[PDB]
Structures are given as structure tokens and as C-alpha cells.
């Protein structure tokens, strides 16, 4: 099965997320399959730092408002869909994530909002580097992964 942790923000790269300010009430992901994140930053920084959120102290904690309007927030978005990179094909990297928890966005705010088809999992306080498996770069012209240039994260620590 998947290990469950009492700390729903075990995955976070940023200490000090205030779980009680997350609204509306979060439905936490309890599975442990691979998740994906498109990002413009290459693995040199992402594997060293993990994914930190833009604004844990003063960002937008309401999940509905954060989906309606992109704005600094305590959340790092990922998706259940390996192929979401093809929509976001101008972001040069597709990161493969194996992290506990996260807020299942469609379970929390419903499945009819603007980004429901992106099947998102939002990580409050981001995702520490030990939960990032690796990356594949994305070719903008063909919208495909450059699979000969993928890279494992030296800091990935398997946990199940």
C-alpha cells in the first residue's frame, strides 16, 4: 500500500505552512503514484532546492481563488497526468514527483472549474527535493519529451 503520515505537509520544502489557513477544507491525496510538474527551471536548481512555493507567509490560501486567478500562493501545483506537459509545452522540463500527500484539487473544489481537466494535486509548502524522482526535458516544437536527456535526481529517497 501507500504509507500515510500524520503530518499532512510532510512533503513540504517550506517549513511553517499553516495548514489551518487552507480553505475550503482540503481533501488530501492518499495514493502514492507518480505525479508531474512542468517548470521552466532546469534540474541544476530544482534537484538542489526542491520546489518551494512562491509565498507561504502571505500568499493565497483559498484553493478556489488560487485556481481562478494565478497569484503567489503557498501551493506548488502538480498533476496526475503524465502528458500535461504537452499543454504546457513551452515550459522546458517535465518533473516526475513521488511525494506523500498533497491536496487533491478536484476532490476539494469540485470537477467543473476552469482547470479541472488538469487533475491537479496542490502541495502546501511545496515539495522537498527528496521526493523528486527526476526530469525529462521537453521539445517545444514537437511537444514531446527528449527521453535521451532525462536525468535522475541524486537526492531522490524512495519511501515505498
The response to whether 90 counts as a known ligand-binding position is yes
Burial of 21 (0-12, 13-18, 19+ CB in 10 A): exposed
- N- to C-terminal Cα separation, the chain: 8
The response to whether 21 counts as a known ligand-binding position is no
CA distances from 48 to 16, 67, 103, 124 (A): 20, 28, 24, 19
Q: What angle do CA 90, 92, 128 make, to 5 degrees?
A: 125
Burial of 144 (0-12, 13-18, 19+ CB in 10 A): middle
Other CB atoms within 10 Å distance of the CB of residue 152: 13
Q: What is the 3-state secondary structure (H, E, C) of the chain?
A: CCCCCCCCCCCCCCCCCCHHHCECCCCECCCCCCEEEEECCCHHHHHHHCECCCCCCCCCCEHHHHHHCCCCCCEEEEECCHHHHHCCCCCCEEEEECCCCCEEHHHHHCCCCCCHHHCEEEEECCECHHHEEEEEEEECCCCEECHHHCEECCCCCCCC
The response to whether 40 counts as a known ligand-binding position is yes
The response to whether 79 counts as a known ligand-binding position is no
The response to whether 39 counts as a known ligand-binding position is yes
The response to whether 38 counts as a known ligand-binding position is yes
Q: What are phi and psi of 48, to 5 degrees?
A: -75, -45
Expressed in Å, this structure's resolution amounts to: 1.5
User: Among 95, 90, 81, 87, which residue's Cα sits nearest to residue 141?
Assistant: 90
The response to whether 8 counts as a known ligand-binding position is no
Cross-strand bridge partners of residue 62: 23
CA gyration radius, the chain: 15
The response to whether 28 counts as a known ligand-binding position is no
Q: Which three cell numbers stand for residue 133?
A: 524522482
In angstroms, the CA 44 to CA 62 distance is: 31
- Residue pair 67/114 in contact by the 8 Å Cβ criterion: yes
Q: Determination technique for this PDB entry?
A: X-ray
Amino acid at each position: 500500500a501507500c504509507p500515510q503520515f500524520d503530518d499532512r505537509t510532510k512533503a513540504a520544502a517550506d517549513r511553517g505552512v499553516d495548514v489551518d489557513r487552507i480553505t475550503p477544507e482540503p481533501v488530501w491525496r492518499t495514493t502514492c503514484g507518480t505525479l508531474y510538474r512542468s517548470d521552466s527551471r532546469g534540474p541544476q536548481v530544482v534537484f538542489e532546492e526542491g520546489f518551494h512555493a512562491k509565498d507561504v507567509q502571505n500568499g493565497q490560501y483559498d484553493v478556489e481563488k488560487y485556481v481562478l486567478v494565478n497569484q503567489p500562493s503557498p501551493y506548488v501545483s502538480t498533476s496526475y497526468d503524465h502528458d500535461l506537459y504537452k499543454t504546457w509545452y513551452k515550459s522546458g522540463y517535465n518533473y516526475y514527483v513521488d511525494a506523500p500527500g498533497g491536496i487533491d484539487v478536484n476532490k476539494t473544489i469540485g470537477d467543473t472549474h476552469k482547470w479541472a481537466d488538469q487533475v491537479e494535486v496542490a502541495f502546501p509548502g511545496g515539495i522537498q527535493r527528496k521526493y523528486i524522482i527526476g526530469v525529462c526535458p521537453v521539445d517545444r516544437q514537437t511537444k514531446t519529451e527528449i527521453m535521451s536527456d532525462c536525468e535522475s535526481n541524486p537526492h531522490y529517497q524512495p519511501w515505498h
